[PDB]
Amino acid sequence: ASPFRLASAGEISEVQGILRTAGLLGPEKRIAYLGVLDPARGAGSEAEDRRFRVFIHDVSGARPQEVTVSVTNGTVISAVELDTAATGELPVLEEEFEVVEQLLATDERWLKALAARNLDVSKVRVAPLSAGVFEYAEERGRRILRGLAFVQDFPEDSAWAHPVDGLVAYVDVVSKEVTRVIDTGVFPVPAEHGNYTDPELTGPLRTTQKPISITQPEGPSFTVTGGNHIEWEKWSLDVGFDVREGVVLHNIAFRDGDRLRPIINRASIAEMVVPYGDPSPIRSWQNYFDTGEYLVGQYANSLELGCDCLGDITYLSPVISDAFGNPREIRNGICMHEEDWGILAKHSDLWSGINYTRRNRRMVISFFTTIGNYDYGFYWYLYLDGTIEFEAKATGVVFTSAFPEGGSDNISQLAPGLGAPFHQHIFSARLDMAIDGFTNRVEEEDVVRQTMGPGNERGNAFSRKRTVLTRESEAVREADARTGRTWIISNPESKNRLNEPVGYKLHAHNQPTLLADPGSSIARRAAFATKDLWVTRYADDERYPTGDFVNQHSGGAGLPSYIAQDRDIDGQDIVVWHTFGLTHFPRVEDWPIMPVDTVGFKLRPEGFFDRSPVLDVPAN
Amino acid sequence: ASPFRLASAGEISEVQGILRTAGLLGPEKRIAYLGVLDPARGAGSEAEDRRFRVFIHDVSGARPQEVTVSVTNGTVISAVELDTAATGELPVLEEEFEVVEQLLATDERWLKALAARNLDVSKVRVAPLSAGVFEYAEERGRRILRGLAFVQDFPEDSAWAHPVDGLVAYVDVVSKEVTRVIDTGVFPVPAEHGNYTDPELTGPLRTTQKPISITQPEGPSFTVTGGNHIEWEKWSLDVGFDVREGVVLHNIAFRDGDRLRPIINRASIAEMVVPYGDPSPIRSWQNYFDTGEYLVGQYANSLELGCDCLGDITYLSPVISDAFGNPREIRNGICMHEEDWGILAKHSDLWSGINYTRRNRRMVISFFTTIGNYDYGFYWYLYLDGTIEFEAKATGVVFTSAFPEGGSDNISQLAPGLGAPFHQHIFSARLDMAIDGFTNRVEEEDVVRQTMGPGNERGNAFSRKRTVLTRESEAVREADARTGRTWIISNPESKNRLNEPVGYKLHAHNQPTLLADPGSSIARRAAFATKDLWVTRYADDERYPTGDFVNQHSGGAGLPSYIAQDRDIDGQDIVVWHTFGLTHFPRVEDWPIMPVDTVGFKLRPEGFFDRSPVLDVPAN
Numbered sequence A, B: 001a002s003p004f005r006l007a008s009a010g011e012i013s014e015v016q017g018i019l020r021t022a023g024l025l026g027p028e029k030r031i032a033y034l035g036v037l038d039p040a041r042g043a044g045s046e047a048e049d050r051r052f053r054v055f056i057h058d059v060s061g062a063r064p065q066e067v068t069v070s071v072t073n074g075t076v077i078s079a080v081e082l083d084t085a086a087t088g089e090l091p092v093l094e095e096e097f098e099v100v101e102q103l104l105a106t107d108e109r110w111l112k113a114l115a116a117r118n119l120d121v122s123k124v125r126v127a128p129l130s131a132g133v134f135e136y137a138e139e140r141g142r143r144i145l146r147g148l149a150f151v152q153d154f155p156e157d158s159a160w161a162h163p164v165d166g167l168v169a170y171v172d173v174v175s176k177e178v179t180r181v182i183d184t185g186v187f188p189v190p191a192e193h194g195n196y197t198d199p200e201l202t203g204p205l206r207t208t209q210k211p212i213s214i215t216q217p218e219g220p221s222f223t224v225t226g227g228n229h230i231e232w233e234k235w236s237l238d239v240g241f242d243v244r245e246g247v248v249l250h251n252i253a254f255r256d257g258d259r260l261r262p263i264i265n266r267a268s269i270a271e272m273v274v275p276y277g278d279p280s281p282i283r284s285w286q287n288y289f290d291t292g293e294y295l296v297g298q299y300a301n302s303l304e305l306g307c308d309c310l311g312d313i314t315y316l317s318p319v320i321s322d323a324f325g326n327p328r329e330i331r332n333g334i335c336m337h338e339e340d341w342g343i344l345a346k347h348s349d350l351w352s353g354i355n356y357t358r359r360n361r362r363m364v365i366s367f368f369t370t371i372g373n374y375d376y377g378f379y380w381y382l383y384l385d386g387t388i389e390f391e392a393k394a395t396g397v398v399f400t401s402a403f404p405e406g407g408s409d410n411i412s413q414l415a416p417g418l419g420a421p422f423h424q425h426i427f428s429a430r431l432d433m434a435i436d437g438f439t440n441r442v443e444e445e446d447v448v449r450q451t452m453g454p455g456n457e458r459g460n461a462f463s464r465k466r467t468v469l470t471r472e473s474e475a476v477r478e479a480d481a482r483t484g485r486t487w488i489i490s491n492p493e494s495k496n497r498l499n500e501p502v503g504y505k506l507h508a509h510n511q512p513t514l515l516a517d518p519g520s521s522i523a524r525r526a527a528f529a530t531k532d533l534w535v536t537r538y539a540d541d542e543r544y545p546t547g548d549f550v551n552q553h554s555g556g557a558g559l560p561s562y563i564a565q566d567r568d569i570d571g572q573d574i575v576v577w578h579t580f581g582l583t584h585f586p587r588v589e590d591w592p593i594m595p596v597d598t599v600g601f602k603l604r605p606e607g608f609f610d611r612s613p614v615l616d617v618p619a620n
Ligand SMILES: [Co+2]
Pocket: A394, A423, A425, A584
């Protein structure tokens, strides 16, 4: 009954029917993206109108279409033909992942290159990589995929151990033509295997790890109603799932006594890019927008009990559409559970003789996705004290190359002859703010050092300053770890008992942002990644920091364009977009398989409550 | 047995006996500090020589003494009389704490000040605080404590809710004289109570929290041998405990195949300072060196099972000396256990069809201390992948003041009329490095951005640069979050299989360092806190960043003086001193009792291993 419920198999079947009927679905059509639309803030419309947005590709070569259907009324609300050269190509179809290797296998230029390296073509795997936009004029308007080769000695062999450097191919996946084969030179193909399940590599497994049992004899403290509505320790929210963004959080609110107070209207990771810093032409075009170009939600893993999610787990199995409009369920794709989080508050008072100790807990909502060589875990945490946090865990197998003789300023050696090009994993968290409602503003808070002199004779004083961001043209901010810079989102019309606008403070990790030269294509295509914080006026069509069609889009889409509107954000319905990421110079320890590396951010109440919101937690 | 075992009750009684026998511990003498000394460098000496260092105070006013005794040989190695005005006063004695309130209770200037505020002296608690070094010439050479008053309405009342502003007194605790009583004017004493156990404030307690049971059916995976020697998942180390530093980690090593490889010889929190930023003369002198002045270890709490340490816990009960040289045990003062830590590594490979997932875990060694209104937890973590991490958890009750009528740039409001002056909690981790042995060096690593042009035509290249710190003169470094600055400690004579020096990378949180004006007393006394990283050449008498005697001691000792030696640190026995802390602007959510805030740092292997060290980890 909730308009925020997860899409049903039936709704997806219904979208397929509606499309078929309107002639929008046929033999050469493929659904590149399908997802339910969020309500448009105005529940006075009553009843219910579940709309779905669909990106439709044409395998023949016809122009793709963006269509919005209404499943409640069984109608097509809109259907527009897209000029991809103008607005960008559609998301890479999973069924195109095989195409690059197949087309190359019969290409004489490709075969020539493999022959010179004495590589058996039936053993050469080709990775279907996004192309981006560079100097290839003939690529505009065409759906191109690039391929890098890796040798797979046998079926269960890890091909990443055997990159074939000095060679790269470009393929038009619609016309099915290999547009180009570049061979800069032969590089020895690294010989050592990276088979982490091979006992010759692992060695005898440890027998020292004793069991750790995490159990809840009375069940979890959270309740799930309406399929995806969670209620836990004063928190209330709806767990959504979109094929592009993955787990999305809706209506995050906290029941402060009598009122259910909203905090964040919608929380999601709206983009996730992996730019490479190897200037070799074989890889210099490499930039994977895992969310925008590949769609991380579709590759979500089915999480095994005990192994991926330990303790008392409650699962959600979201349903998505396949290339033909048929619903596909991602069994056990989302984990929900609460975990102990050490000490919450503690004080042993001499004067009162009272010794007080309370334990903390966090509600966890997570999913794990696989995009080629990388695997990422997305974790959302809600704490007892009102803190909200996001954490991304990056693992998988590093993307390899050959390690140049003479070394490299842009690649690190992992094994003999094996290299790992430098890269970053940069995320964008889109936070549609609702601090006690939609009338919000953001202030940049810096610590302020003071000079010893009149009024500060001992030179011990230090303060803080807050600068309200009033217009979008002033809402593109950078980090300043040195002055403890943070950003506070408040409601200027909702004050706490001390008469101060209630608020929440965003604590960033202050990791480096996009390193690429400002004039590079990736800098223009992923401009969101060049700054730590952006603030925009809400707009239902401004969903991604990189725009709706990221694949081969020329640049400037998303945030730089939205920000150009210079709308009033001082006490308005606003959205915070936080850029955060990892900068990787892979180590030997990252080979053969990478141990988890993490990054994230969190928001803590800043005068939101009238006192500590955790005084009612029992000693237990 | 092992020269790193914890001090036993017998050794402490024996030190007392040896001091008594030597005429160094008569009736007027008090032990202000007693601790076991680490074995000397190069155990070429036959057998064990357990040495104890002692700071002896004289209650009659005679000069104190620093003494080292050999408990093994029953001898006094050295005994020197100290000139406190020059070298610093001894740490504050627990017995001197109560003296301030007692003396003030009969001082007429104090009584007059209380009468002016209509406060009953029998209800006015006085917080005995370290004095620091300011313009009071008569304090040089004397043991002074300053007092700030808080009203306690009834025995179980939290006095912190009722600060008495405009008043401060200075007391000589040896001659027992009130040297000064300053009253700048009456301020309303905040009225609301801060009784977090009062059902009137808490409201009905939650009944929603279901149990989370964490058990280990077969016991823990780590072994405790020789009282404090731990072996866990390839890690090896000794858990020591010092009254000043608290938990100290010795000989941290990792068993890589056949060889036990040293990583860190000694790890401890060598100092922690809490500077206040309110320029009011009532508090502008306020700076607590919890470790150096108070000795955090002596105030360690006895940890309760289930409350403080959940799971299968193995406790250590360290023994310390009382003021008379008699042994005193801190029952269950240290918790040791291992905890599940999510996913270690994961990858679902399309090409091979192999899906691989491994769970992580960490060894935890912690203790919690209480110094007046603050309570701090010190946590050391050892992970499966070779990562070492420290985390400080700050909770307790906020130090209060009155909230000025017309607001404040240095104090925030917590409740009506109740203020919380701005302050910081800054720690100094002393890491005596032994990366594969003692021949080590440190390099500062910065991410390097590259300009688009020749050799980087697409403007996508990015690199890194490492600068070796060769002499102590150039080893005082600051954070640079923007360029991803880290510091790598390597052994230039021990190379991995790829012929690169093995190393460990230090990742700092890059929080603001000391904010006080560089010309302030605190900037000079806590000079270590003004920079993020210092590297010194090891010396057995360079133990704390602030020197042996911090109490009422000016600048002249500690890190700035050691560094002046400008010793060779390029491939030598070196020590890394990392400054990291929290900058606090108290929020309403921090009142009446503060929820835990955290800060720390970690070190990750950087080419130390020849490949991932966790390939032998089984299913889990
Ligand atoms: Co990476």
